[PDB]
């Protein structure tokens, strides 16, 4: 039994209806190849497309790269092609866009769904990024190591009230003097990087009245010493996409957040 604070017991049914099946994202720092998945280090990129620019235009840098030939299948997910995550190095916020967080301004999201073989048509040399002003997120390249896992709706994903009826104020409010120790335990149990699951988040899910049929969490990517990475202040980042433009595979509405204390 997966462990439930006691007052929390009675919701036990109701919270494996909720469990979803996802992709646990161990990292280890290190070299990766073209066609890897990986955090940061060098994307997969043919010469005759346009490479991703900022609105100064200015070139990207590779946030992350998931090939959906080297994870779990997901139910909906692709099952095969490179989907990949770029932000603006120049900006003190990560390229998130402050205004509408599916506009890809500052930050850009793409799909290869045919992979070319021949390596002499492929940029290998990245040299011509720049380096921004303040730190990169992630500062050293991570190898990924995908395990399939399973999890119940988390209280900070705007889906919880969904499964509860109700907000999470009342909800967590009914526990009295317990509120927070259960609150937190079950916020805690989230966190990590993934793909698919729930959403953490370290202040307040976007998502609600905004993008509320950005379901579909594509990935996350948490605060870690073990790769060098760090959202502000011990933050966390994630990309969300509504079922229908998952199933059209177009990922011109992709939901950028991250936030941290």
Known sequence: MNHLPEKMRPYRDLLEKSAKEYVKLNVRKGKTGRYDSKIAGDPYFPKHETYPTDENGQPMKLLAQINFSHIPQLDGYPSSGILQFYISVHDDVYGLNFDDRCEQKNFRV????????????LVSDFS???????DFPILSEAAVEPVKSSEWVLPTDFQFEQYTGMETMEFFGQFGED????????AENGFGHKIGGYASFTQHDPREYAYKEHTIML????????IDSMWGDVGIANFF???EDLRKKDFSNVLYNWDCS
């Open 241 to 243: 996409i509504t079922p």
């Open 110 to 121: 793409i799909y290869f769904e045919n992979i070319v073989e021949n390596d002499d048509e």
């Open 219 to 226: 990935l996350q990517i948490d605060s870690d010493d073990d």
């Open 179 to 186: 509120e927070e120790d259960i609150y937190n335990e079950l």
């Open 128 to 134: 011509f990024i720049g380096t921004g002003e303040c």
